[model samples]
Target: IVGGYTCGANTVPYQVSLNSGYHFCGGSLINSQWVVSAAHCYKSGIQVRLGEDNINVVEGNEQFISASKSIVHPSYNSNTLNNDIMLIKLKSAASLNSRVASISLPTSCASAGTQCLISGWGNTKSSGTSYPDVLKCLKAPILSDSSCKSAYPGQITSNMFCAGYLEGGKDSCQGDSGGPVVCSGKLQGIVSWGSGCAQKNKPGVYTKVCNYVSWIKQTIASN
Candidate 1:
């Protein structure tokens, strides 16, 4: 998981607010008509809150979008979570606010070991409890396929992106999944999972956005 240079390393550029409670993850504004988030984050009767600070304080300019439907990745399986991706169609086009709008997808993904930013409200310490209010972010480098494979030989794919610090203080823990792993000011990946959240030699993994570009365009056209 890449981290954001938000208010602090432990803060994120975005957060999601559910009708029932709040979440400490990140999302991208795609074309003002749809938002891309993790499938696991989906809950019935939930609205996505983008660009916010503390859930109670609401300092950052918050934007609310109603979910028209939740399209869980067709191959998604809750057990192993092979394809833990989800697309959210908003009832109406989202208005562009400098604070909240669609985030750009990277035309080209970063090369192996490239630098990137992972921004979210993930846990600060590895074993610490969840922080529903404050968003946290951290900066880390991308992992080459070989390096990531050496770390988690069990599950590594071209669709997965590797990023995190070797020492591992900053990572997207439980609530930070589905957040953005941005590089070069473009969306690169979505937080999926790692061997372990914030573990040495075990960087956060993500879903490559380029692989899903065609799907995004197709979905946008259909919807």
Candidate 2:
């Protein structure tokens, strides 16, 4: 699982597993055919799996669709990891069901200190060798940009935001990248990267979703 506890099946229906031959990253379904994720997660032969919590077994409601196209932000900077967002278009649209749904994109930026939820199937511990079969979730408290900068120093950028605790022990880890950071029922951030898994005073960094609203809309419309 991710950093926290186990989540019920279909709790976050929009959650998807980006399988690059294996479960590598997480993504969120923004629509029937489009998924939003982190640009750094790009890889060949990526597939999107939805409507199920367990990655090991194929549930009846699962939608395993091939990715038709992956649109990594043109301004994406690998060195600084700025503009780290990406969109994936499925070859075939997923059918809406109780186990499959889309999440709403943010209409505005989330203020500092906003409480949000993040879910994924990443490693439970930083040193863990295996990822959980069932999905996991945790609540993260957004930190002010200044607060984040203090932790990351020159690494924090406008394209990124921070969440978690100063005391740490609770944050996303490897395999959780590209997952959604849901705030106020809308997608506010994406699990991008961090210093280490749940380190002391080190919070997880995420792609600020609100900053790319126009680009996301424009790209989806044209593509």
Candidate 3:
């Protein structure tokens, strides 16, 4: 996470790491058996490690579980990055506790200017490699659709929204995709893509999670 602060231990219980052999993307535990992430982060084998704080250290509070199924959105478009959401059904239900828990999906859409929190273990540098060993978080406000469109002309679709300062100091970067954009304690966005890590007038783009509430429920219920 670029220009972010280290998060408190187990502060983001719903936050998880999507790993195969090592850390790849961030994810959110939406339910005991379901995790929400970005479609572009999907792979056949993913180990959903919950209650994780430090990526390089053994915290002992972690719960590592394998994904039984990886379901990417049917209409997900990689080129345009539309419908960038995905779901991962766990091989077994996660035992919820103080260090491990699920987050609630947003009941209503988050409007522009809404302050939100973005957390992950993504690169801290905009250009070189600098992935943090511990999770990091940033406080940013959602930008108006018109303003966002002005930044990425013809690329800001309904499925995406931009967050961070026009001055561009803070953002979710590489290795943070599929991470949580929590607003008012609800999952509102999933870190998707952007022009760079954090650039002026080119804020980080995220999958608008509020737009897929029904789809999420239907998928979980059906599966």
Candidate 4:
């Protein structure tokens, strides 16, 4: 994420890279065999890598696996980017370790003013080619619905929420989509989109994951 701190090799164990030879999007491993990502990040020939710290260098703890299948939310709208969540089944489960693990989903909806953490290897700048080799993380709080709606009028839906500074210092940028937004140790959001990286009044928008927790469990159980 832009304007954030570089994290340790395995500080975020649940973080994974959705790759197409290079990082396409970041994801969170919800299960050893199932991953949570953004629907817009979907593409053919996708690969999943766990325990990744530096994208430019290979680490022994990394687990590279193929996505066996993908299940995009049926009502996903690409134009408006609504319901922009997806689940991916790994061809094989990642072997759990200190560097590879799953993240827990929230049992309740996230509240405004809640402190949150967002991490990824997105561009360090708002507009250039500064993709960090190591993962970066930022601390941003969940903004109130009224504030988010007004910031991007007619764009912020119930399925999406905003987090980050309104003054524009730190926010997820390009290459950070589908990454996790953790609040109080629960998966609360997924990196989705924004007008621009860390722009004033344009905090990073994310899929409101608490709204789809049931669907996620149902999909994994039936699939």
Better TM-score candidate (2, 4) = 4
Q: 1-223 in candidate 4: lDDT tens per residue?
A: 8889988889999999999999989999999899999999999888999999988788788989999999999999999999999999999989999899899999998899999999998888976678888999999999999889989999988999999989997899988999999999999999999997988888999999999999999999998
Hey, what RMSD does candidate 3 come out at?
0.8
The better candidate by lDDT, 1 or 3, is: 3
| lDDT by residue (tens digit), candidate 2, 1-223 | 3359988888999999999778999999999999999998998788999986889987677889999999999999999999999999999999988789999999999999899999999878865566899899999889998889999999998889999988877889888899989999999999999987888878999999999999999999999
lDDT of the candidates, in the order given: 0.67, 0.91, 0.92, 0.93
Which 10-residue span in candidate 4 carries the lowest summed lDDT?
122-131
RMSD of each: 2.9, 1.1, 0.8, 0.7
Question: Could you give candidate 1's per-residue lDDT for residues 64-132 as a string of tens digits?
Answer: 777788787777766665666778777777656655556676777678777667766665556646454
Off by over 4 Å in 4: none
Q: In model 2, where is the ten-residue run with the lowest total lDDT? A: 122-131
Which of the predicted structures, 1 or 2, would earn the higher TM-score when compared with the native?
2
For model 2, name the residue pairs that clash.
Answer: 1-132
For model 2, how big is the CA root-mean-square deviation? 1.1
Ordering by lDDT: 4, 3, 2, 1
Give all TM-scores, in the order shown.
0.86, 0.97, 0.98, 0.98
